[PDB]
Short mmCIF file of C-alpha atoms (C1' of nucleotides) in Angstrom, two decimals:
data_model
loop_
_atom_site.label_atom_id
_atom_site.label_comp_id
_atom_site.label_asym_id
_atom_site.label_seq_id
_atom_site.Cartn_x
_atom_site.Cartn_y
_atom_site.Cartn_z
CA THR E 1 80.24 168.42 -66.15
CA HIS E 2 78.84 171.22 -68.29
CA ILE E 3 76.00 169.79 -70.30
CA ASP E 4 75.76 171.11 -73.40
CA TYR E 5 73.13 171.97 -75.92
CA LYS E 6 71.54 168.94 -76.77
CA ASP E 7 72.30 167.51 -73.52
CA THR E 8 69.14 168.03 -71.99
CA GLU E 9 67.82 164.79 -73.23
CA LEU E 10 66.88 163.58 -69.71
CA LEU E 11 66.65 167.16 -68.61
CA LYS E 12 64.05 168.64 -70.77
CA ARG E 13 61.52 168.26 -68.03
CA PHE E 14 63.69 170.95 -66.89
CA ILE E 15 64.45 172.96 -69.75
CA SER E 16 61.56 175.47 -71.18
CA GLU E 17 61.05 177.37 -74.13
CA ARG E 18 59.75 180.11 -71.42
CA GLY E 19 61.76 179.95 -68.13
CA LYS E 20 60.89 177.40 -65.66
CA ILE E 21 63.55 175.85 -63.45
CA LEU E 22 63.11 173.10 -60.68
CA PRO E 23 65.26 174.26 -57.56
CA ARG E 24 66.97 171.67 -55.46
CA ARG E 25 63.84 170.40 -53.34
CA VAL E 26 61.81 170.44 -56.48
CA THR E 27 64.08 167.38 -57.64
CA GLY E 28 65.46 166.25 -54.11
CA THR E 29 69.17 166.50 -55.10
CA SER E 30 72.30 167.48 -53.22
CA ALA E 31 74.63 169.89 -54.19
CA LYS E 32 76.16 168.55 -57.21
CA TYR E 33 72.59 167.49 -59.02
CA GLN E 34 71.11 170.68 -58.30
CA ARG E 35 74.21 172.56 -59.37
CA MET E 36 74.22 171.03 -62.58
CA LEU E 37 70.53 171.81 -62.75
CA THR E 38 70.96 175.37 -62.04
CA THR E 39 74.51 176.08 -63.94
CA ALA E 40 75.01 173.46 -66.77
CA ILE E 41 71.78 173.03 -67.93
CA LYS E 42 71.98 176.83 -69.00
CA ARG E 43 74.35 176.54 -71.66
CA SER E 44 71.08 174.81 -73.38
CA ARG E 45 68.25 176.74 -71.36
CA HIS E 46 69.41 180.39 -71.57
CA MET E 47 71.35 180.86 -74.78
CA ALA E 48 68.47 180.78 -77.45
CA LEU E 49 65.88 178.90 -75.50
CA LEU E 50 64.93 181.47 -72.88
CA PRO E 51 64.31 185.40 -73.72
CA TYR E 52 65.20 186.70 -70.21
CA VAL E 53 63.55 190.25 -70.65
CA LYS E 54 64.09 192.94 -73.10
CA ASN S 1 35.78 196.97 -93.80
CA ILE S 2 34.74 195.09 -90.77
CA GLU S 3 36.53 192.86 -88.16
CA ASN S 4 39.52 195.05 -87.85
CA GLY S 5 40.07 196.87 -84.21
CA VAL S 6 42.02 196.10 -81.07
CA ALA S 7 41.13 198.10 -77.93
CA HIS S 8 44.94 198.07 -77.20
CA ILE S 9 44.67 198.89 -73.04
CA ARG S 10 47.31 201.02 -71.50
CA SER S 11 45.92 200.16 -67.71
CA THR S 12 48.14 199.84 -64.86
CA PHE S 13 46.96 199.12 -61.28
CA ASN S 14 45.59 202.82 -62.10
CA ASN S 15 45.11 204.45 -65.18
CA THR S 16 42.53 202.48 -67.01
CA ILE S 17 43.21 203.92 -70.27
CA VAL S 18 42.44 202.10 -73.69
CA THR S 19 43.05 202.98 -77.60
CA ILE S 20 40.07 201.89 -79.33
CA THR S 21 42.98 201.41 -82.42
CA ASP S 22 43.54 199.05 -85.33
CA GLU S 23 44.91 195.58 -85.18
CA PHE S 24 48.46 197.38 -85.67
CA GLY S 25 49.54 201.19 -84.69
CA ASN S 26 46.72 203.69 -86.53
CA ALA S 27 44.98 204.88 -83.46
CA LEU S 28 41.41 205.83 -84.23
CA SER S 29 40.06 207.06 -81.00
CA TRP S 30 39.16 205.92 -77.74
CA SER S 31 37.11 206.36 -74.88
CA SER S 32 40.17 205.88 -72.31
CA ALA S 33 40.65 207.49 -68.80
CA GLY S 34 40.99 210.80 -70.09
CA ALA S 35 37.52 210.66 -71.64
CA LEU S 36 34.66 209.85 -69.44
CA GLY S 37 35.27 212.68 -67.16
CA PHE S 38 38.63 211.22 -65.52
CA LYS S 39 42.45 211.94 -66.17
CA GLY S 40 44.23 208.84 -65.31
CA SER S 41 46.29 206.81 -62.69
CA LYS S 42 43.46 207.41 -60.21
CA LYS S 43 41.03 206.34 -62.71
CA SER S 44 41.00 202.48 -61.49
CA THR S 45 37.36 202.34 -62.72
CA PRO S 46 36.21 201.39 -65.90
CA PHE S 47 34.17 203.76 -67.04
CA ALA S 48 37.01 204.98 -69.39
CA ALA S 49 35.64 201.99 -71.19
CA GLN S 50 32.57 200.52 -68.88
CA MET S 51 30.10 201.73 -71.73
CA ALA S 52 31.23 204.61 -73.34
CA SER S 53 33.59 203.08 -75.29
CA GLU S 54 31.61 201.31 -77.45
CA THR S 55 29.67 204.43 -77.86
CA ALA S 56 33.00 205.60 -79.54
CA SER S 57 33.27 201.81 -81.46
CA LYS S 58 29.93 201.88 -82.77
CA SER S 59 29.84 205.70 -83.70
CA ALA S 60 32.65 204.49 -85.62
CA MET S 61 30.83 201.28 -87.04
CA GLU S 62 34.05 200.72 -89.25
CA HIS S 63 35.62 197.73 -87.00
CA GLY S 64 32.86 195.33 -86.66
CA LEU S 65 35.34 193.72 -84.33
CA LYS S 66 34.23 189.97 -83.33
CA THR S 67 37.57 190.23 -81.94
CA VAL S 68 38.72 193.57 -79.87
CA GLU S 69 41.72 191.99 -77.90
CA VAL S 70 42.30 193.99 -75.20
CA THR S 71 46.25 194.17 -75.13
CA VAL S 72 47.46 195.09 -71.28
CA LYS S 73 50.69 196.00 -69.97
CA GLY S 74 49.62 195.80 -66.35
CA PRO S 75 46.99 195.07 -63.86
CA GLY S 76 43.98 197.42 -63.27
CA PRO S 77 40.40 197.16 -61.61
CA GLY S 78 38.53 198.71 -64.69
CA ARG S 79 40.54 197.02 -67.07
CA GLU S 80 38.17 194.01 -66.80
CA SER S 81 35.42 195.93 -67.33
CA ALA S 82 37.29 198.26 -69.46
CA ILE S 83 35.88 195.45 -71.93
CA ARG S 84 32.34 196.13 -70.81
CA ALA S 85 32.38 199.04 -73.36
CA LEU S 86 33.34 196.07 -75.71
CA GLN S 87 30.30 194.03 -74.29
CA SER S 88 27.85 197.06 -73.85
CA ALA S 89 27.07 197.60 -77.69
CA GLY S 90 28.73 194.06 -77.57
CA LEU S 91 31.58 193.83 -79.77
CA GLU S 92 32.72 190.14 -78.70
CA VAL S 93 35.51 189.96 -76.26
CA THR S 94 37.52 187.33 -77.47
CA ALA S 95 40.92 188.05 -76.06
CA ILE S 96 42.83 189.04 -73.06
CA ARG S 97 46.72 189.83 -74.08
CA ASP S 98 48.04 190.66 -70.61
CA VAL S 99 51.83 190.67 -71.27
CA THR S 100 55.07 192.67 -70.70
CA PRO S 101 57.63 192.67 -73.27
CA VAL S 102 60.16 189.83 -73.82
CA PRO S 103 62.34 191.08 -76.73
CA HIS S 104 66.03 191.07 -76.00
CA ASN S 105 67.82 193.66 -73.87
CA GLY S 106 70.21 196.26 -75.92
CA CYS S 107 73.12 197.29 -73.98
CA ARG S 108 75.12 198.44 -70.64
CA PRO S 109 71.40 199.70 -69.82
CA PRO S 110 69.10 201.36 -71.68
CA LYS S 111 65.99 199.08 -70.18
CA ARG S 112 63.14 197.08 -71.09
CA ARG S 113 60.79 194.45 -69.41
CA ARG S 114 61.35 193.19 -65.93
CA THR C 1 49.98 185.88 -75.86
CA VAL C 2 46.90 184.71 -74.61
CA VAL C 3 43.49 184.64 -76.20
CA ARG C 4 40.62 183.82 -73.92
CA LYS C 5 36.75 183.98 -75.51
CA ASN C 6 33.61 182.71 -74.13
CA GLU C 7 33.28 184.79 -71.01
CA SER C 8 31.42 187.71 -69.51
CA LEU C 9 33.40 190.93 -68.72
CA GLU C 10 31.69 191.48 -65.61
CA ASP C 11 32.56 188.43 -64.76
CA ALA C 12 35.91 189.25 -66.35
CA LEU C 13 37.05 189.77 -62.52
CA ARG C 14 38.05 185.92 -62.93
CA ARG C 15 39.26 185.90 -66.46
CA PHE C 16 42.05 188.46 -66.17
CA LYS C 17 43.88 186.23 -63.41
CA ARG C 18 45.00 183.16 -64.51
CA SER C 19 47.82 183.29 -66.95
CA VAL C 20 50.63 185.37 -64.77
CA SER C 21 52.72 183.38 -62.04
CA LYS C 22 53.86 180.15 -63.91
CA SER C 23 57.46 180.34 -63.71
CA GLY C 24 60.36 178.65 -62.33
CA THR C 25 62.69 181.14 -63.75
CA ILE C 26 60.25 183.86 -62.84
CA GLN C 27 63.31 185.79 -61.93
CA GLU C 28 65.73 184.98 -64.32
CA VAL C 29 63.37 186.30 -66.89
CA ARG C 30 63.47 189.97 -65.40
CA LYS C 31 67.31 190.19 -65.45
CA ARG C 32 68.27 193.27 -66.94
CA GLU C 33 65.62 195.96 -65.77
CA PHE C 34 65.09 196.55 -61.94
CA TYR C 35 67.37 195.23 -59.38
CA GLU C 36 66.47 195.09 -55.44
CA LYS C 37 67.22 194.64 -51.99
CA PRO C 38 67.05 191.36 -49.94
CA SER C 39 67.34 193.59 -46.59
CA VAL C 40 64.21 192.18 -44.67
CA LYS C 41 64.68 188.69 -46.85
CA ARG C 42 68.11 188.49 -44.97
CA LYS C 43 65.87 186.07 -42.57
CA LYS C 44 65.61 183.93 -45.72
CA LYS C 45 69.24 184.76 -47.66
CA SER C 46 71.57 182.18 -46.40
CA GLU C 47 69.56 179.84 -48.70
CA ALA C 48 69.90 177.06 -51.01
CA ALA C 49 72.69 176.95 -53.83
CA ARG C 50 73.18 180.37 -55.40
CA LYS C 51 76.49 180.02 -55.24
CA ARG C 52 77.41 178.32 -51.72
CA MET T 1 30.28 203.87 -24.22
CA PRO T 2 34.74 200.19 -26.60
CA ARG T 3 36.35 197.43 -24.91
CA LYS T 4 32.83 196.39 -24.25
CA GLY T 5 30.64 196.90 -27.20
CA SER T 6 26.90 196.92 -27.75
CA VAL T 7 24.33 194.03 -28.21
CA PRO T 8 20.34 193.88 -29.05
CA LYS T 9 17.43 195.79 -27.42
CA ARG T 10 13.97 195.13 -26.58
CA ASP T 11 10.59 194.85 -28.22
CA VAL T 12 6.92 194.83 -27.55
CA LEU T 13 3.48 192.41 -27.22
CA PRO T 14 0.23 191.59 -29.17
CA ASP T 15 -3.61 192.44 -28.00
CA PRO T 16 -5.86 189.93 -27.36
CA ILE T 17 -8.30 191.58 -29.92
CA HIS T 18 -6.42 191.12 -33.06
CA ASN T 19 -3.27 189.29 -31.81
CA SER T 20 -1.20 192.54 -33.19
CA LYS T 21 1.56 194.14 -31.85
CA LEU T 22 1.79 196.26 -34.43
CA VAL T 23 -0.97 198.14 -32.80
CA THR T 24 0.72 197.63 -29.36
CA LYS T 25 3.89 199.61 -30.28
CA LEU T 26 1.99 202.56 -31.64
CA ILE T 27 0.00 202.67 -28.51
CA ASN T 28 3.30 202.44 -26.58
CA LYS T 29 4.12 205.74 -28.21
CA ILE T 30 1.33 207.02 -26.13
CA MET T 31 1.25 204.79 -23.38
CA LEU T 32 0.93 207.30 -20.73
CA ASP T 33 1.77 206.17 -17.20
CA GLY T 34 -0.27 203.52 -17.10
CA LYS T 35 -2.96 206.16 -17.85
CA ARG T 36 -3.91 205.49 -21.21
CA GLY T 37 -7.39 206.58 -20.34
CA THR T 38 -8.41 207.85 -23.90
CA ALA T 39 -4.69 207.45 -25.26
CA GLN T 40 -6.37 204.21 -26.18
CA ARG T 41 -9.06 206.23 -27.66
CA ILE T 42 -6.08 208.23 -29.74
CA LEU T 43 -4.85 204.78 -31.11
CA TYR T 44 -8.19 203.37 -31.70
CA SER T 45 -8.92 206.92 -33.67
CA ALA T 46 -5.36 206.51 -35.58
CA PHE T 47 -4.55 202.73 -36.39
CA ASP T 48 -8.18 202.36 -37.47
CA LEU T 49 -7.96 204.88 -40.40
CA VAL T 50 -5.98 202.33 -42.82
CA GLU T 51 -8.44 199.62 -42.01
CA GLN T 52 -11.15 202.00 -42.52
CA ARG T 53 -10.06 204.21 -45.57
CA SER T 54 -8.56 201.15 -46.77
CA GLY T 55 -11.45 198.40 -46.83
CA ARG T 56 -9.16 195.45 -45.48
CA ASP T 57 -8.04 195.00 -41.78
CA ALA T 58 -4.87 195.14 -40.04
CA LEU T 59 -3.58 192.05 -41.97
CA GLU T 60 -4.12 192.69 -45.97
CA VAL T 61 -4.02 196.26 -46.75
CA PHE T 62 -2.12 197.30 -43.61
CA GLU T 63 0.38 194.45 -44.42
CA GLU T 64 1.25 196.54 -47.68
CA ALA T 65 2.83 198.89 -44.74
CA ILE T 66 3.64 196.36 -42.15
CA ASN T 67 5.57 194.00 -44.22
CA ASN T 68 8.14 197.15 -44.82
CA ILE T 69 8.91 198.81 -41.61
CA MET T 70 11.51 196.55 -38.62
CA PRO T 71 13.13 194.60 -40.17
CA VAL T 72 14.14 191.27 -42.26
CA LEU T 73 16.14 192.87 -44.77
CA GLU T 74 17.51 196.27 -44.02
CA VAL T 75 20.57 198.27 -45.04
CA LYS T 76 23.66 197.67 -42.89
CA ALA T 77 27.62 197.44 -42.91
CA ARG T 78 30.34 195.78 -41.20
CA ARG T 79 33.62 196.62 -39.50
CA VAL T 80 35.48 198.24 -42.82
CA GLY T 81 36.54 201.51 -40.99
CA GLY T 82 35.97 205.26 -42.82
CA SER T 83 35.43 204.33 -46.32
CA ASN T 84 32.43 203.80 -48.35
CA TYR T 85 32.21 200.03 -48.61
CA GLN T 86 28.49 199.66 -49.07
CA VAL T 87 26.41 196.29 -50.11
CA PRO T 88 22.94 195.01 -49.64
CA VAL T 89 22.38 192.85 -46.45
CA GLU T 90 20.02 190.63 -45.01
CA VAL T 91 19.50 191.11 -41.00
CA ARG T 92 17.02 190.18 -38.03
CA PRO T 93 14.96 191.67 -35.65
CA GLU T 94 17.80 193.10 -33.69
CA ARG T 95 18.50 196.69 -35.17
CA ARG T 96 15.41 197.73 -36.85
CA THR T 97 13.96 198.97 -40.09
CA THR T 98 11.86 197.09 -42.86
CA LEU T 99 9.23 194.47 -41.79
CA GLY T 100 7.15 195.62 -38.58
CA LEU T 101 7.70 199.37 -36.94
CA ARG T 102 10.27 201.81 -37.21
CA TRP T 103 10.84 204.97 -39.31
CA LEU T 104 9.27 207.34 -42.08
CA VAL T 105 5.63 206.66 -43.96
CA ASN T 106 2.87 207.27 -41.17
CA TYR T 107 2.90 210.24 -38.93
CA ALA T 108 -0.70 210.02 -37.91
CA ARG T 109 -0.27 213.55 -36.20
CA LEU T 110 0.71 215.99 -38.13
CA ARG T 111 -1.75 218.63 -39.43
CA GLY T 112 -2.84 222.11 -38.61
CA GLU T 113 -3.74 222.10 -34.90
CA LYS T 114 -1.79 221.76 -31.47
CA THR T 115 -3.75 218.27 -30.75
CA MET T 116 -3.92 214.62 -30.17
CA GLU T 117 -7.64 214.26 -30.29
CA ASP T 118 -8.05 214.90 -34.03
CA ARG T 119 -4.52 215.16 -35.13
CA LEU T 120 -3.85 211.57 -35.26
CA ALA T 121 -6.87 210.66 -37.43
CA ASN T 122 -5.55 213.42 -39.97
CA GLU T 123 -1.90 212.37 -41.26
CA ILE T 124 -2.78 208.81 -40.64
CA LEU T 125 -3.33 206.97 -44.03
CA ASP T 126 -0.44 207.27 -46.55
CA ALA T 127 0.78 204.05 -45.77
CA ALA T 128 -1.93 202.62 -47.70
CA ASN T 129 0.10 200.86 -50.36
CA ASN T 130 3.40 201.85 -48.65
CA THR T 131 3.44 205.47 -50.32
CA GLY T 132 5.72 208.05 -48.46
CA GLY T 133 3.47 210.92 -46.38
CA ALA T 134 5.42 211.62 -43.24
CA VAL T 135 7.65 210.77 -40.79
CA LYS T 136 6.58 207.67 -38.54
CA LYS T 137 7.13 204.12 -40.04
CA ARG T 138 8.98 203.32 -43.07
CA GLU T 139 9.15 204.51 -46.31
CA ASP T 140 13.14 206.45 -46.55
CA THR T 141 14.92 203.22 -44.90
CA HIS T 142 15.03 201.20 -48.26
CA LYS T 143 17.17 203.51 -50.89
CA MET T 144 20.70 204.22 -48.96
CA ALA T 145 23.93 203.71 -50.65
CA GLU T 146 24.04 202.84 -54.60
CA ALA T 147 25.59 206.08 -56.11
CA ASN T 148 29.23 206.55 -57.16
CA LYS T 149 30.68 204.71 -60.15
CA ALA T 150 33.08 206.54 -62.19
CA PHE T 151 34.73 209.13 -59.71
CA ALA T 152 33.65 206.88 -56.56
"C1'" C D 1 84.93 182.88 -50.70
"C1'" G D 2 88.46 187.57 -49.42
"C1'" A D 3 93.79 191.49 -46.40
"C1'" A D 4 89.47 193.51 -45.18
"C1'" G D 5 85.17 197.11 -46.77
"C1'" G D 6 82.90 192.67 -47.58
"C1'" C D 7 82.20 189.15 -51.90
"C1'" G D 8 74.79 188.11 -56.19
"C1'" A D 9 72.15 187.98 -62.93
"C1'" C D 10 73.67 183.91 -65.15
"C1'" U D 11 77.06 180.61 -70.46
"C1'" U D 12 82.26 180.59 -68.83
"C1'" U D 13 87.40 181.93 -66.38
"C1'" C D 14 91.28 181.23 -62.25
"C1'" U D 15 88.67 177.69 -60.40
"C1'" G D 16 92.93 180.59 -57.99
"C1'" G D 17 92.08 179.21 -52.86
"C1'" U D 18 87.92 176.25 -49.26
"C1'" C D 19 87.10 170.98 -49.44
"C1'" U D 20 87.32 165.86 -47.76
"C1'" G D 21 88.98 160.49 -49.75
"C1'" U D 22 94.26 159.42 -51.18
"C1'" A D 23 97.25 161.90 -49.79
"C1'" A D 24 102.47 159.67 -53.57
"C1'" C D 25 107.27 162.60 -49.69
"C1'" U D 26 112.85 165.81 -47.28
"C1'" G D 27 113.67 166.84 -42.27
"C1'" A D 28 111.17 172.10 -37.59
"C1'" C D 29 111.31 173.90 -42.46
"C1'" G D 30 105.08 178.20 -38.20
"C1'" C D 31 101.47 181.76 -35.09
"C1'" U D 32 101.83 186.12 -33.41
"C1'" G D 33 105.23 189.79 -33.90
"C1'" A D 34 110.58 194.88 -36.52
"C1'" U D 35 109.95 194.65 -41.82
"C1'" G D 36 106.33 195.15 -44.77
"C1'" U D 37 100.47 194.03 -47.54
"C1'" G D 38 96.43 196.45 -49.47
"C1'" C D 39 92.40 198.78 -49.16
"C1'" G D 40 87.55 199.58 -45.87
"C1'" A D 41 81.41 201.27 -46.43
"C1'" A D 42 79.12 205.10 -46.88
"C1'" A D 43 78.05 211.23 -45.23
"C1'" G D 44 81.85 212.79 -48.28
"C1'" C D 45 85.63 212.05 -51.60
"C1'" G D 46 89.62 215.01 -57.01
"C1'" U D 47 86.14 215.13 -64.76
"C1'" G D 48 81.23 214.21 -69.11
"C1'" G D 49 76.83 212.87 -67.28
"C1'" G D 50 73.37 214.21 -62.64
"C1'" G D 51 68.15 217.56 -61.34
"C1'" A D 52 66.39 210.66 -66.16
"C1'" U D 53 64.31 208.34 -60.91
"C1'" C D 54 64.65 210.08 -56.03
"C1'" A D 55 65.75 214.81 -53.58
"C1'" A D 56 66.50 218.14 -49.45
"C1'" A D 57 65.23 223.94 -50.62
"C1'" C D 58 61.38 226.78 -52.76
"C1'" A D 59 55.83 225.81 -54.49
"C1'" G D 60 51.46 223.97 -52.42
"C1'" G D 61 47.94 222.10 -49.61
"C1'" A D 62 45.53 221.42 -45.27
"C1'" U D 63 43.88 217.86 -40.58
"C1'" U D 64 40.65 219.41 -35.95
"C1'" A D 65 40.67 224.04 -32.96
"C1'" G D 66 47.86 224.03 -36.52
"C1'" A D 67 53.17 224.72 -42.05
"C1'" U D 68 56.77 225.20 -45.90
"C1'" A D 69 56.58 219.74 -41.70
"C1'" C D 70 54.60 213.64 -41.92
"C1'" C D 71 53.40 215.25 -48.33
"C1'" C D 72 56.11 215.88 -52.83
"C1'" U D 73 56.02 216.23 -58.83
"C1'" G D 74 58.74 221.30 -61.84
"C1'" G D 75 62.61 221.18 -59.00
"C1'" U D 76 68.86 223.36 -56.10
"C1'" A D 77 72.66 220.40 -56.29
"C1'" G D 78 73.24 215.41 -54.73
"C1'" U D 79 72.05 210.71 -56.26
"C1'" C D 80 74.86 207.59 -60.44
"C1'" C D 81 78.59 205.55 -63.78
"C1'" A D 82 83.97 205.62 -67.89
"C1'" C D 83 89.72 208.84 -64.51
"C1'" G D 84 91.45 209.51 -57.33
"C1'" C D 85 89.47 207.35 -51.77
"C1'" C D 86 89.22 208.15 -46.92
"C1'" G D 87 91.63 204.54 -43.00
"C1'" U D 88 85.53 206.09 -39.82
"C1'" A D 89 79.37 201.73 -39.04
"C1'" A D 90 75.74 197.88 -34.12
"C1'" A D 91 82.92 196.34 -39.65
"C1'" C D 92 80.08 194.17 -32.73
"C1'" G D 93 82.59 188.48 -31.40
"C1'" A D 94 81.95 194.88 -26.48
"C1'" U D 95 85.24 189.05 -26.93
"C1'" G D 96 92.87 189.60 -31.01
"C1'" A D 97 95.24 185.77 -33.95
"C1'" G D 98 99.12 179.58 -33.39
"C1'" U D 99 99.06 173.11 -30.35
"C1'" G D 100 94.78 170.40 -28.52
"C1'" C D 101 90.97 168.85 -25.80
"C1'" U D 102 86.04 170.30 -22.42
"C1'" A D 103 79.96 163.46 -21.82
"C1'" A D 104 79.48 165.02 -25.72
"C1'" G D 105 75.62 164.71 -28.61
"C1'" U D 106 73.10 166.75 -32.84
"C1'" G D 107 70.80 166.69 -38.34
"C1'" U D 108 73.29 168.53 -42.07
"C1'" U D 109 76.45 171.87 -47.24
"C1'" A D 110 81.20 170.08 -49.13
"C1'" G D 111 84.46 165.92 -50.23
"C1'" G D 112 84.86 160.82 -49.11
"C1'" G D 113 84.55 155.13 -47.23
"C1'" G D 114 81.03 152.54 -48.10
"C1'" G D 115 76.54 148.20 -46.78
"C1'" U D 116 72.33 148.56 -48.99
"C1'" U D 117 72.64 150.22 -54.33
"C1'" U D 118 67.91 152.36 -54.06
"C1'" C D 119 65.01 154.04 -57.64
"C1'" C D 120 70.33 157.90 -56.69
"C1'" G D 121 67.45 156.54 -51.89
"C1'" C D 122 67.32 153.73 -46.16
"C1'" C D 123 71.70 152.39 -42.40
"C1'" C D 124 77.29 153.22 -40.41
"C1'" C D 125 82.00 156.12 -40.19
"C1'" U D 126 83.59 160.93 -41.43
"C1'" U D 127 85.31 165.55 -40.81
"C1'" A D 128 86.69 172.66 -42.33
"C1'" G D 129 82.61 173.48 -40.97
"C1'" U D 130 76.48 174.01 -40.20
"C1'" G D 131 73.63 174.68 -36.93
"C1'" C D 132 71.31 173.06 -32.19
"C1'" U D 133 71.42 172.03 -27.86
"C1'" G D 134 74.54 170.17 -23.94
"C1'" C D 135 79.70 167.83 -19.60
"C1'" A D 136 83.37 170.18 -17.29
"C1'" G D 137 84.98 174.93 -16.96
"C1'" C D 138 83.51 180.73 -17.03
"C1'" U D 139 82.39 185.58 -14.64
"C1'" A D 140 78.07 188.73 -10.23
"C1'" A D 141 74.82 187.57 -13.42
"C1'" C D 142 74.07 188.58 -17.84
"C1'" G D 143 75.38 184.46 -20.44
"C1'" C D 144 79.45 181.87 -22.91
"C1'" A D 145 81.30 176.41 -24.11
"C1'" U D 146 83.91 169.61 -28.73
"C1'" U D 147 83.21 176.09 -32.68
"C1'" A D 148 83.79 180.77 -25.67
"C1'" A D 149 82.56 184.31 -21.75
"C1'" G D 150 86.63 176.73 -20.44
"C1'" C D 151 90.74 173.64 -19.87
"C1'" A D 152 97.18 172.80 -19.91
"C1'" C D 153 101.33 174.27 -23.89
"C1'" U D 154 102.11 180.52 -28.97
"C1'" C D 155 102.28 185.51 -29.35
"C1'" C D 156 100.03 190.27 -29.51
"C1'" G D 157 98.45 194.41 -27.42
"C1'" C D 158 95.27 196.67 -23.26
"C1'" C D 159 94.67 198.74 -19.12
"C1'" U D 160 94.84 197.71 -12.74
"C1'" G D 161 90.77 204.35 -11.00
"C1'" G D 162 88.43 206.67 -14.19
#
RNA sequence: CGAAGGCGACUUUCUGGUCUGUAACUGACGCUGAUGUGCGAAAGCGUGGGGAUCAAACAGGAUUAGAUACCCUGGUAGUCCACGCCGUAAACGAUGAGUGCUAAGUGUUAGGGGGUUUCCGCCCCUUAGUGCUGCAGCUAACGCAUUAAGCACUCCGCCUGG
């Protein structure tokens, strides 16, 4: 699914205040778990948890 | 009026220049890369502020900066010893703020940090 | 953002190095500034999970 | 001459009088064809003038000179190409400048005649406490490559 | 993934479509080929920007026994995006697109059946592919091949001197 903003409870190891994702082999995941890692976390991680750049 | 001054250092890979300024923008003076015989962007050497920036800082004597806080926006060889002119007369190098911006990002581009 | 004290400045050769690289999204920082080519990196751009 | 390169060199042997080759290489500066008939005497009217003008023999006050001529520590650099790239370096007796025999202080023979008989006794004692004089043994092989800082 | 040129920031979209596990079901209802489908990258291409970067030109420098050139900031446009594209690339698969195999193997993205469930992992079946090799076949050889440069049923176009 598209895990929402507080839906990083067992995933804030992956979340960061300042920009750290774990890619595929970093968690040993396939192309659904890594994919939620890289897309579905972002609703919590990017919009008001990561200043990209100015 | 002591303990007030920042060596806000605009040092890239070259161009070891640093303003011996206040903690915020008022800009007293400097021994920068246009100050100790050089011009800048080939001064990848500390002698902007190897020795002769604390010449300026102690000719001022108003900072008394126990915290001189070189603030960088890039690399530089002479920048780690651009703070030797904050150790020469000994103004107690205490911080290294080597950061590029992360405010956020105006529009269909103007531009800002990478 | 970094304040390091208690170090010499002819020894600042070692103090100016160690707060740089640590970021898993070091790219998703950079976003909207300066964007480049993978040309020689097309040796390694069939790559993991970007969109395929 | 590459592909090939360069490898170390030769040296000298002492004498049964004092067990010293510092005097030997200095005679080998003058060792005419095996006929050292008074090249021996020219050496013994050169080398004796540091042991005579300075009271101590070849091993104490001459040591002020002959601790500092062909090396233990000299100036040298490595394969770095056409740049400055200079730093102090420890060395062996292969290529030679700062413990036994080499370059500057001690031209024994450089005064106002065209002689060898008395000229060697003339300009000899300047390496009493390793103080310059004229080009035979050390002085100027110590102070090479420590100049540029700002506009380097 | 797209008709291609090609397709890249991500929250999202249609998730269109791939996609494999189910496929719930009337009775040839398709490939190529009159139709017709669209564009195809740039050099260049019909408006503000554009000389801001880069950048030809010019400057200006000079190797060692040789420039204005490798050298380029000011800088000529151009570069570039909010209104028009050509039908060209090593778009090369030098290898056209339907029915199916060629001992087959191979580890694997997807989606599944699962055992064991693990501590989300070990083992078996799996295919669009993914690669790897590798049987037959292939041509002179290059070298191709369960996914052609083979094998038996479809069309297309090419040319049998250039």
